[PDB]
Specification:
monomer; binds ligand A1A7X; 2 domains; four-stranded mixed β-sheet; about 600 residues; AftB-like; elongated
Length: about 600
């Protein structure tokens, strides 16, 4: 009836407007949020989907947000791509919320066919309130595209579940089924963890197909683009994984650390009350072969199990330094099936059954009310590596809303990098100076005579910056200046580095600067390198990089691309992925088998 359709529309409009206003009132783009940006700039300048010119390191786990922002930046005439990232994050996240609302509305629709009820926003409303969700709806991270994808997939899965009406014996439109399969396949691309959902989404559809031929067709059509881009990834990167995810070696069974992260995430907002209350409310509302998998209860179980598995995977992998970025997706999955709750009357009219309202609207008030307390409650990010990155970068730079990459220049070491680069025109390896905030320069190898004069527009050497914060360098340093990270976000040598101790999460595997100065035309002798580096480590690392395996891995990720290079990378992606380099230069030279040079 209109009395319920309009109520659903008003709930969707209200939540979308509130969430969009909350996003626009916190314009934040993380340092990682500028990594996507860096890559897409390299793509729009003709250098392909790469982080640095020649260094084919895939620092974007999204594979769709990267290209979505690429398209946005292409169409945009304003030189700032940060505005593209902001607009796309807002729009995609708002669309995700709207789509999940409408999917839940369709899920509850069959129950309200003969009974008129007022939908109300719950579960998803608290998600809007939850400050991490509001903060991360704006950054250049995937939490906008992830929300959009989850909303779309939820709506399509609900449509498929209710689609079981036997129009011509197929129980669902062929085109709609194929498109849903395609979306489920794209889950793998959108975010590697989402593959779980994308897996569990496909199987539920596969088991719903009668004949093996139909299952084969569904799995092929649904997973054609993801497999094609996996082949392209193998080729243009030589890695089975994006490259960041490879920066973690033997990372598992961090149950204690993951539990600590979950408790930290729950503490400033008290998510236990929403969880308990929404579980009780969903149960109270619920108290009204292939056929049993293609049912709305099956899809609800799908979304709940997908959220639980996402949370379990995140705990097993350990929540990153982000306050709540990792847990937003599983939490959104949990809240999706109860994203909009109908106040249907039992319609057995004596009052005893009417108590439902007094015990189901009231619960929603105890939900929405908590939401009004959840947003307003400050979100704290004491030895744990969990820090609210939005607050960190707002109080680290000179601005409270660090939207543009020109705003990030106020960061302590990010004006100094530019001053040094224009100060030294013969190249340099820039490292964070221990004495002062400015950069220690290991000057690049002096350019050879007659090559300085044989250069277009004056000779500029190879500038290589080595610093933990990566994206802000990408969008402030310049397109042609190599950008590298200690952890291995965009450093091919660091990503392969093996780890000895668990340490901290997201920042433990700090590669030695000796490795960083090992590669590139950078001077080695003690007088020119900074004092606080060890020359012996530098020489040992340089001797280590010449080993056949590491040298071959680097060549396959830096040599000029071609058909032969693409085929060889596809063939040897497995070999390159399962190749770990010991952190200590001396122990590597022992492992690789090359002799240790004398001091
Ligand atoms: C199949 C399943 C379910 C399990 C394995 C699948 C898998 C590979 C696991 C997850 C990989 C992982 C840790 C990704 C972390 O991404 P993140 O730290 O956000 O990336 C940085 O943030 C920016 C935008 O994301 C990027 O520019 C930066 F790189």
């Amino acid at each position: 009836h209109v009395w319920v359709r309009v109520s659903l529309w008003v709930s969707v409009v209200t939540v979308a407007a509130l969430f969009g206003w909350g996003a626009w009132q916190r314009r934040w783009i993380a340092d990682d949020g500028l990594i996507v940006l860096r890559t897409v700039r390299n793509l729009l300048a003709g250098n392909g989907p790469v982080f640095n010119a020649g260094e084919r390191v895939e620092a974007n786990t999204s594979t769709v947000w990267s290209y979505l922002v690429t398209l946005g930046g292409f169409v945009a005439g304003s030189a700032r791509l940060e505005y593209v990232a902001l607009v796309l994050a807002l729009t995609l996240s708002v669309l995700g919320v709207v789509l999940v609302m409408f999917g839940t509305a369709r899920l509850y629709a069959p129950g309200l066919t003969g009974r008129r009820a007022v939908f109300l926003p719950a579960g998803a409303l608290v998600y809007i309130a939850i400050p991490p969700a509001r903060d991360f709806a704006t950054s250049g991270l995937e939490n906008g595209l992830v929300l959009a994808y989850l909303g779309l997939l939820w709506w399509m899965m609900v449509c498929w579940s209710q689609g079981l009406r036997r129009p011509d014996g197929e129980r669902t439109s062929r085109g709609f089924d194929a498109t849903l399969a395609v979306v489920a396949g794209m889950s793998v691309l959108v975010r590697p963890e989402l593959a779980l959902i994308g897996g569990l989404a496909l199987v539920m559809m596969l088991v719903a197909a009668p004949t093996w031929r139909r299952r084969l067709a569904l799995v092929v059509v649904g997973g054609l683009i993801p497999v094609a881009y996996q082949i392209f990834r193998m080729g243009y990167y030589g890695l089975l994984v994006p490259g960041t995810a490879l920066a973690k070696d033997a990372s598992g069974a961090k149950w204690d650390q993951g539990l600590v992260y979950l408790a930290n995430f729950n503490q400033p907002y008290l998510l236990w009350a929403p969880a308990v209350l929404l579980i009780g409310l969903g149960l109270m509302v619920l108290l009204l072969i292939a056929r049993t998998v293609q049912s709305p209860p099956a899809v609800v179980a799908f979304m709940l199990i997908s959220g639980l598995l996402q949370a379990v995977y995140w705990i097993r992998q350990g929540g990153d330094f982000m306050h709540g970025r990792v847990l937003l997706t599983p939490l959104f999955c949990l809240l999706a099936p109860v994203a909009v709750i109908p106040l249907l009357l039992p319609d057995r009219a004596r009052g005893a059954g009417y108590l439902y309202a007094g015990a189901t609207a009231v619960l929603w008030l105890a939900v929405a009310g908590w939401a009004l307390w959840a947003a307003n409650s400050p979100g704290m990010g004491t030895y744990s590596g969990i820090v609210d990155e939005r607050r960190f970068y707002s109080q680290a730079t000179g601005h409270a809303h660090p939207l543009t990459a020109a705003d990030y220049l106020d960061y302590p070491r990010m004006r100094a990098v530019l001053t040094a680069i224009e100060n030294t025109p013969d190249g340099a390896l820039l490292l964070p100076s221990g004495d002062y905030d400015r950069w220690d320069v290991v000057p690049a190898l002096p350019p050879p005579p007659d090559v300085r004069a044989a250069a277009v527009g004056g000779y500029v050497g190879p500038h290589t910056v080595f610093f933990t914060n990566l994206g802000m360098l990408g969008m402030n340093v310049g397109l042609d200046v190599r950008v590298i990270d200690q952890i291995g976000l965009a450093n091919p040598l660091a990503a392969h580095t093996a780890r000895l101790t668990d340490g901290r999460i997201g920042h433990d595997k700090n590669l030695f600067p000796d490795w960083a100065v090992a590669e590139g035309p950078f001077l080695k002798e003690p007088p020119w390198i900074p004092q606080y580096l060890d020359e012996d480590w530098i020489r040992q690392a340089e001797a280590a990089l010449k080993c056949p395996e590491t040298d071959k891995v680097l060549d396959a990720i830096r040599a000029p691309m071609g058909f032969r290079r693409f085929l060889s990378n596809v063939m040897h992606a497995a070999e390159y992925t399962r190749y770990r380099i010991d952190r200590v230069p001396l122990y590597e030279l022992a492992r690789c088998g090359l002799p240790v040079p004398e001091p």
